[PDB]
Structure formats: C-alpha cells, structure tokens
Amino acid sequence: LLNMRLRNISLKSEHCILSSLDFQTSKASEQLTKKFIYPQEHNSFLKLNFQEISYKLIDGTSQIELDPICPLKVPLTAFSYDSISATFKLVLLPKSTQPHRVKITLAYELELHPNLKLPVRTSWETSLVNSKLSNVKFKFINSNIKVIKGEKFTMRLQIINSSSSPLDLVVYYNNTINPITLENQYQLHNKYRKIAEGIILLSNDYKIPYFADLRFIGIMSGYYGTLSGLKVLDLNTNELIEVGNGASVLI
Amino acid sequence: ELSAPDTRNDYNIRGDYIATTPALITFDGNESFINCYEITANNNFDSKDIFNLKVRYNTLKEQLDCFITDAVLIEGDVEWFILFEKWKTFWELEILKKLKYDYDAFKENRIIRLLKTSIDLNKTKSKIRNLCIEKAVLDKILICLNKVSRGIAVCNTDMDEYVRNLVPKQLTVPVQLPGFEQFFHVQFEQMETSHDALHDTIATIGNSLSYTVIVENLSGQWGQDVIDDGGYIFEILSSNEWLIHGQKRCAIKEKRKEFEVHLIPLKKGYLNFPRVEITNIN
Amino acid sequence: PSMDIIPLNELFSSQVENVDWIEYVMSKIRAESNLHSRDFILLLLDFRNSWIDGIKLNVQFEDFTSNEYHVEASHTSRIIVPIKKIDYKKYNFENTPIPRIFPGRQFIQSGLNEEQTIEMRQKFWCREHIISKLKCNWKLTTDQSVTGSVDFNKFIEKFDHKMVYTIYPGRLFYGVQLLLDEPKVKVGEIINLKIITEPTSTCRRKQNSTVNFLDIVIFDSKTSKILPRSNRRILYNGSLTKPISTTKVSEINLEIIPIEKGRYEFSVCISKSNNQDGIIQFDSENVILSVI
Numbered sequence: 001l002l003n004m005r006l007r008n009i010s011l012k013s014e015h016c017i018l019s020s021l022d023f024q025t026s027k028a029s030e031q032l033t034k035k036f037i038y039p040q041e042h043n044s045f046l047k048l049n050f051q052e053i054s055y056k057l058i059d060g061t062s063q064i065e066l067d068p069i070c071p072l073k074v075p076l077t078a079f080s081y082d083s084i085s086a087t088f089k090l091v092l093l094p095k096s097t098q099p100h101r102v103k104i105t106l107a108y109e110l111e112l113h114p115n116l117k118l119p120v121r122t123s124w125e126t127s128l129v130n131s132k133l134s135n136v137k138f139k140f141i142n143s144n145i146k147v148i149k150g151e152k153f154t155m156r157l158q159i160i161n162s163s164s165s166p167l168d169l170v171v172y173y174n175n176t177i178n179p180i181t182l183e184n185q186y187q188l189h190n191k192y193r194k195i196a197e198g199i200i201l202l203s204n205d206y207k208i209p210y211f212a213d214l215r216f217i218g219i220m221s222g223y224y225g226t227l228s229g230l231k232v233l234d235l236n237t238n239e240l241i242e243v244g245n246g247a248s249v250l251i
Numbered sequence: 252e253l254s255a256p257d258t259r260n261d262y263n264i265r266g267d268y269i270a271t272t273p274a275l276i277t278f279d280g281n282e283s284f285i286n287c288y289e290i291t292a293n294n295n296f297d298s299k300d301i302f303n304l305k306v307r308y309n310t311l312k313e314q315l316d317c318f319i320t321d322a323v324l325i326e327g328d329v330e331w332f333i334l335f336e337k338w339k340t341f342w343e344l345e346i347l348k349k350l351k352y353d354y355d356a357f358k359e360n361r362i363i364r365l366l367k368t369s370i371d372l373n374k375t376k377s378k379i380r381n382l383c384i385e386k387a388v389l390d391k392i393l394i395c396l397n398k399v400s401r402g403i404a405v406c407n408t409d410m411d412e413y414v415r416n417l418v419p420k421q422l423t424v425p426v427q428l429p430g431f432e433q434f435f436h437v438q439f440e441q442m443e444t445s446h447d448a449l450h451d452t453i454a455t456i457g458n459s460l461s462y463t464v465i466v467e468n469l470s471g472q473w474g475q476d477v478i479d480d481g482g483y484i485f486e487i488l489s490s491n492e493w494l495i496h497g498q499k500r501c502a503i504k505e506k507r508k509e510f511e512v513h514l515i516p517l518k519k520g521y522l523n524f525p526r527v528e529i530t531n532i533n
Numbered sequence: 534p535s536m537d538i539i540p541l542n543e544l545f546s547s548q549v550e551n552v553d554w555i556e557y558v559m560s561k562i563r564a565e566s567n568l569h570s571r572d573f574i575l576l577l578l579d580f581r582n583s584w585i586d587g588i589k590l591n592v593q594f595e596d597f598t599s600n601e602y603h604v605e606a607s608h609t610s611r612i613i614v615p616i617k618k619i620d621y622k623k624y625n626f627e628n629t630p631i632p633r634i635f636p637g638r639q640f641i642q643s644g645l646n647e648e649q650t651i652e653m654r655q656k657f658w659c660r661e662h663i664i665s666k667l668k669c670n671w672k673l674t675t676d677q678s679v680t681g682s683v684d685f686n687k688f689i690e691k692f693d694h695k696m697v698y699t700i701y702p703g704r705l706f707y708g709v710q711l712l713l714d715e716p717k718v719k720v721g722e723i724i725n726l727k728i729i730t731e732p733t734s735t736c737r738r739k740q741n742s743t744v745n746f747l748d749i750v751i752f753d754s755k756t757s758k759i760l761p762r763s764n765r766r767i768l769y770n771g772s773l774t775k776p777i778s779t780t781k782v783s784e785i786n787l788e789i790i791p792i793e794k795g796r797y798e799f800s801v802c803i804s805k806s807n808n809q810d811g812i813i814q815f816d817s818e819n820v821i822l823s824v825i
Contacts (some may be wrong), residue, residue, distance in 0.1 A: 010503070012477050015444055020480075020500060067441055067482050067498055079497040080505070082480050134712075151549050175537055176695060182809055183758060186750055186802065189815050190758075197491065197539060202611045204535070204579060217613075219575075220542050222755070223473065249448070265723065268770050272786060276771060279807075283761050287768035287790050289723065357807035359742055403744040403776075450755060453765055453793060473755055 002029045002047065002114070003102060009085070009124035017087045019122050021054065021098055022080035036210060046105035050188060054083055055097035057119055061098075061168035073105075073164045085122060093123035127245050133236075136161050141211075146248035148218055152202070155246065167209035169234040173201040194220065195228050198250075221250045253288050253423060256300035263291040275407040277311070279357055302423035309417055311353070315345055315362055316396070317413045318404065324385065325391035334385035335479070342385070352400070363400035428459035430521035432490040434509060438483040438532040441498070447474025449501070454528040464510045465492070467528060469501050478502040481532060491515045513526035536689060537577040538699040540817070541570050541615070554615045557597055571817060574618045574699060576663075582611045587674030587721050603674065619662055621703030621734065626658050627651055648738075659700050664689065689740045706813070707734055707777075707803060711820040719825055724789045728801060729782065736779045743780060745805050749773045749787060752798040754821055767792055774804075794824035 004026040009019035033045060050071050053061035065083040072079070085094065099117035128139045141156035157171070178192045196218035206212065225247045231240055255262060266289035277285050290297075315483045320342070325331035335342065372393070374388055401505040451470050458465045472478045482498040492511035499505040511526070541558070550556045558573045580590060582604050590602035594614050604610050642650045664685060672680045698704035708731035714724050728749075751767055752758045759766050768790035777783040796822045804812045
C-alpha cells in the first residue's frame with residue numbers, strides 16, 4: 001500500500017510473448033504520507049527503488065528485462081519495464097516472481113526500508129493460408145520481407161498438397177479496379193485503385209503443374225500489406241482462394 | 252472579416268475571406284464552409300482581448316426572385332413604368348407567399364414554386380384590378396416561375412441591383428488558459444518485430460485546471476500492430492512537472508502522461524497556456 | 534492470347550534505370566518538360582509459343598527497342614511496351630471506315646444509335662491505332678535464320694471498357710491539370726491552389742445540369758485521407774465543393790493555409806449533383822507538395 005503494480009502481457013504471435021510490469025505511485029497512499037510530510041515541511045515523497053527484479057518462477061529460474069534500468073527514485077510517478085517471454089504452443093501457463101525494493105527517505109537518515117514481491121502467472125492471453133477444401137496449404141517461403149526499389153523480384157509460393165493429382169491450378173493477379181459515407185466511397189476507391197495498378201505479375205496465368213517463382217515488377221510505392229489480387233483457381237468449380245499473405249514496401 | 256480589438260494590440264493578421272472570385276458563395280445548412288484565419292502575434296505575447304467578426308450575409312429567399320421580378324415581369328421600362336409602381340406593395344404581398352423550392356435547390360431546380368397553391372391564386376385579379384402589364388402579364392410570369400426552372404442561370408449577374416446587405420457582427424473571444432512552460436522528451440526505439448515505418452501526428456498542448464493534468468499520446472504506426480517498445484529518456488526542461496512513464500509500448504493503451512499540477516509556472520508568455528512538448532524518437 | 538493495359542504513376546530512379554521501358558520513358562521525358570507521367574501508359578502483351586524451340590522476340594513499337602527476349606518451348610512470357618496515350622485534342626475520332634467490298638448493302642445500326650455506333654467505332658479505331666505501329670521480328674534460337682514477323686489481327690480480340698478509357702482520354706469527362714505555386718513551402722504561409730478543368734466533346738450525352746459539383750480531397754501520401762475537419766493539418770476557405778460548368782475552361786481555387794505537416798497530396802473527383810451515388814468519375818492527377 002504505497003505503489004500499485006500491474007503486469008500487462010501482449011501476445012505477439014509472430015515473435016515471443018511480451019509482458020510488461022508497471023509500477024505506479026498509488027495516490028490513495030500518497031496523500032497519507034503527504035499529510036505527515038507537509039506536517040514535517042516536505043512537498044512530495046522520496047521513495048528510492050534500488051533493486052527491481054523479475055524472476056521466472058519455476059523450481060528456480062530468473063530472467064532479464066529487455067532494456068536497461070538504473071537505480072532510480074521518483075516523487076509521484078510511474079515506471080514500466082518490459083521482459084520477453086517465450087511464445088508457448090499450447091497449455092503451459094508460466095509464472096513469474098517480480099521482486100522489488102522501495103527505500104523510503106527522511107531528513108538525511110531514517111530510511112525506512114521496504115521490500116515487495118508479487119508472484120503470479122504470466123498468461124494474460126486476451127503464415128500458412130489453408131485452402132479450406134482439401135488442405136492444399138500455401139505459404140510463401142519469404143513472406144513479409146521485401147524491400148524492393150521498383151525493380152524486379154521473385155517470391156516462392158510453396159504449395160503443399162495431398163500428393164493426389166498434384167498438377168491442377170493456375171495463378172493470376174486481376175489488374176482490374178473492383179466495382180465497390182462518400183469518403184467511405186473514396187477510401188475504397190483509392191484502395192482498389194492502388195491494389196489493381198501498382199504491381200504487375202510478369203508470369204500471369206502461370207499454370208502451375210511444388211515451388212513457383214512469380215516475378216513481379218511493382219510500379220508504385222507504398223506499403224502493400226496483404227498483397228491482394230493474387231488469386232489462384234483450381235480444377236473444381238470456383239476455388240478462387242486468396243493468398244492473403246506477404247507484404248512488400250517498395251521504397 | 253475578423254479584425255483588431257479596441258486596444259493598441261496591432262496584431263499581424265493575414266488571413267481573411269472576401270468573396271473575390273465569386274460574389275455568390277452559397278451555403279445549404281448541411282456542409283461546412285470552414286473559414287480559417289491566421290492571427291499572428293505582434294511584438295509582445297498575444298493578450299486576452301475580445302475580437303470582432305464581421306459577416307455580410309444574406310438569405311437566398313430575396314435573391315432568387317429578382318429574375319422572376321426584374322427580368323420576367325419588368326422587362327420594358329414602359330411596361331414596368333406604372334404597372335409595378337401602384338402595386339409594388341401588392342407585388343410584395345404577392346411574392347412574399349411564393350414558398351420556393353428550397354428542398355431540392357442543392358443539385359438543380361432553382362427558381363421553381365414547389366406547388367403550394369398554384370391554381371387558386373389567380374383570383375386576385377377580380378377583387379382588385381390594376382395595369383395588365385402587371386395584373387395580366389405577371390400571371391404568365393407566375394407560370395414562368397412555376398415551370399421553366401433554370402439550374403444555374405448565372406444568378407450573380409442579376410444580383411447586385413436588388414439584394415439587401417444584412418450584416419451580423421458577432422464577438423470573438425480568444426478564449427484561452429494561462430500557464431506557459433515547456434518540455435522535451437527524447438526517445439530511442441527498441442526492436443519488436445521489425446521497424447514498421449512510424450509516422451507522426453503532432454506535439455502541442457494547452458492546459459489549466461486544479462490538480463492539473465497534461466496527457467499525451469504517441470505517434471501513429473502503419474505496419475502490423477503491437478509494435479516496437481519505444482524507450483524514452485526525459486529532458487523535462489524549464490519547469491518541474493511530474494512524470495509518469497518510462498519505456499512504453501507504442502501500439503497500446505500506454506500514454507506518456509507527463510502531468511503538471513505543480514509550481515515553477517510562468518504566466519501568459521504566449522497566445523494561451525502553452526507547453527511545446529516536441530517528443531523526439533531519434 | 535490475352536491483353537491488358539495499365540497506366541503509370543512513378544517517375545522512378547536512376548539506379549534501376551536498366552530495363553528497357555523505364556529508360557525509354559525517362560529518356561523521352563528528359564526533353565518536353567511539361568509531362569511527367571500519367572500520359573505514358575503501359576500495355577501488357579503476353580507472347581505464347583506453340584512450337585518446339587526457343588525464339589528471340591524483338592518488339593519495336595515506334596522507336597522502342599527490346600532486349601533479347603528468349604522465350605522457351607511452351608512458355609508464356611509477358612512483354613512490356615510504353616505508349617503515349619491517344620489524345621483527343623490532336624484528333625477527332627467520329628469516322629466509320631467502310632470495308633473493301635463496296636456491295637452497297639447499306640445496313641442498320643440497331644442500338645442507341647448515337648452511342649454504340651460511335652462507341653464500337655471508338656473501340657476499333659483505338660485498335661487501329663494500336664495495330665498500325667506495333668512491330669515484332671522473331672528468329673529461331675541458333676538453328677535457323679527464319680526471321681519473320683507475327684501478325685496480330687487474328688489475335689487482339691476487342692477492347693473492353695477498361696481498355697478504352699485506359700488508352701483514350703476522352704472516354705471519361707473532364708481533363709484536369711493542377712497548377713500550384715510551390716511544392717516546398719514552410720509552415721506559416723498561404724497558398725492559392727488552382728485547378729484547371731477542361732469539359733469535353735463527350736459531355737454531349739447529358740447537357741442537363743450545366744453546373745457540375747466537384748470535390749477536393751486531401752491525401753496524406755501514405756493512405757487514409759483527412760476529414761473535412763482537418764484539425765491542425767490543412768486549412769482552407771469555404772466549402773470545397775466549388776462548381777464548374779459544362780461549358781468551357783472554368784477555374785477554381787482554395788487557400789491551403791498549411792499547419793504542421795509534411796508531404797501532402799491533392800486530387801479531385803466529380804459528383805454531378807449533391808446526393809450520394811452521384812459520383813461518376815475519379816481523376817488521378819495527384820499533385821504532391823511538401824511542408825517543412
């Protein structure tokens with residue numbers, strides 16, 4: 001009851017799990033000792049944090065937070081350090097320790113020493129594109145990695161089949177503006193114009209019969225997230241499924 | 252027009268709006284007409300005076316019928332010599348109940364009656380009789396403002412002869428607060444995922460209250476979210492406020508809330524309360 | 534056995550200037566310092582080989598050159614040529630050419646006779662402009678000297694409606710340029726912006742609303758246009774709707790009083806009316822300015 005602490009954990013699925021604890025000043029405790037401090041002629045507190053440490057709770061383990069920290073001391077404030085976890089596959093809720101050491105202060109003496117440790121479980125918990133018919137999974141072998149400079153480049157759509165008639169389908173890009181609150185008309189028009197006119201796909205109806213190369217050229221700039229347009233089409237009626245994947249800044 | 256107050260301020264205003272390329276800048280109660288004014292401050296800091304707006308507006312309902320009056324039924328100066336003169340207030344008791352088409356006057360269809368009562372109104376010739384260049388020639392002009400509705404018949408050409416110039420002139424408060432200080436936080440980004448190509452919104456503030464607060468929000472990211480933890484390092488210059496953050500996470504509910512409910516506060520050094528924050532992630 | 538036509542927007546850079554079409558358009562735009570892009574559209578031919586050896590595939594359009602486009606056995610390859618688009622202020626295109634059998638049958642037209650009879654005329658006259666220059670010469674890969682051509686009149690199908698207003702300005706309504714003072718203004722300064730609009734010969738379909746409402750929309754040069762309440766970004770005088778005539782070269786204005794920015798973009802659209810779904814075209818003229 002001097003410094004309220006909370007830990008927030010965010011699940012970055014393309015990397016490690018990120019969890020950050022957060023100290024604060026706990027105002028419902030500060031006016032308490034503010035009353036006696038301004039009784040003794042002091043305006044704000046001088047609590048000194050001298051040893052702050054998060055340890056990985058286990059039989060025994062410890063971690064290290066993902067940037068640098070000094071030995072600090074603040075009056076009415078909040079600080080928050082971040083430490084990276086390891087992104088679990090399924091069903092193992094890890095736990096942490098989070099010890100701390102607040103050192104209070106008085107007139108060049110009487111440093112009433114305090115310490116605190118709140119151990120709890122660090123599990124807040126709130127690119128394969130499947131075919132959705134017969135598990136013909138597609139993945140780009142270098143997705144989201146392309147700094148092109150309006151030059152040619154090549155990608156790799158590694159199709160993974162049932163190995164049962166593995167020669168079936170054809171890619172294409174569809175350079176055509178799709179035909180679609182008036183600025184909601186205009187934002188959709190600018191999105192559909194920059195999608196259907198910015199890159200070209202130099203191997204158009206490539207008719208793949210399990211890698212591909214798919215050379216593009218890319219004649220306008222801007223971050224093309226999710227790279228729409230690049231559809232495939234298969235032996236059945238309409239397997240017009242997307243890739244929905246891969247991105248390229250073009251500057 | 253916005254102008255100076257009644258003191259010796261001499262503020263270097265440069266923004267204005269006179270209708271200089273049109274004379275007819277319309278408006279229809281659903282769109283904006285945003286008017287912007289650059290009031291640059293003089294040799295001292297900008298004070299707390301009361302300024303004065305000057306708007307020379309007019310309603311549309313007198314303008315549109317001038318071609319229904321001074322063109323349709325006052326063509327010849329002998330046909331409008333005495334026919335209009337003895338029944339001008341009878342015409343102004345006739346045209347005041349016109350009830351024009353101000354429901355579809357956005358796209359087209361200016362100068363049409365919107366069918367209030369078109370057929371019963373021609374009985375006025377019976378109980379009062381005047382010159383037939385008005386008493387018999389303007390009912391055809393009443394049909395010529397019933398049908399024949401021009402979408403834009405260059406209405407600024409026949410406007411200035413009969414349009415009255417109303418002029419509202421409201422005040423202008425220059426309403427503000429009074430606490431000047433500064434800040435400069437500095438930052439250095441720590442890698443999460445990959446650099447997402449961060450883009451800046453702004454940095455400025457203005458506040459005065461009791462147990463006063465100054466909240467800030469971060470920049471704007473346009474890659475995949477949950478992005479890089481910005482590590483920050485303060486230079487809380489020219490005052491002694493109260494910090495509340497260290498090394499936040501730039502696509503989240505975190506906010507570097509540098510509050511200021513404290514002392515070391517100069518007053519009225521600029522146009523308002525101001526504290527130029529100017530965060531630097533370099 | 535297909536066809537597609539794509540416009541052009543990026544000026545490009547010198548370090549990538551090694552593929553044939555970008556050095557052609559850059560070399561053509563070293564002189565003639567009024568055009569930059571949006572006038573050098575780019576058509577996508579896709580050669581396919583139904584034979585059993587490689588071929589080498591030059592193409593010359595007008596003064597365009599190629600590379601040694603080595604094609605393979607059953608391999609489709611896509612070959613990229615740039616053309617300046619067909620200006621309707623250098624020509625008129627309202628002439629049907631009679632065929633070479635003068636049998637005097639004197640047939641009908643049998644549609645909206647002022648629209649499809651000149652609309653299909655627009656189609657195969659733009660096809661006449663594409664056919665009448667495009668030249669290819671092919672020789673088989675190190676096994677012959679069989680240097681022949683490859684005719685196209687059994688190959689280019691028709692033009693669809695994308696491939697009319699992509700090739701031919703004057704299928705859509707107003708030609709628009711944007712005349713600006715500076716691109717490199719500081720913060721506290723006031724700028725007249727001046728669009729210049731050119732109503733067309735093919736406004737003859739309507740004439741009803743002589744007044745036609747535009748808009749001016751401001752884009753950030755990343756994405757995501759600013760609202761009407763452009764708070765702390767850009768300032769302006771009056772509502773931006775600012776009508777034009779379907780009569781002659783009308784002008785318009787705003788006063789872009791800039792505030793605390795960098796790298797903006799201005800473009801228009803044409804809306805014919807005030808209501809929603811009145812909007813009929815979106816021009817692509819995108820003059821960018823920077824703010825320091």
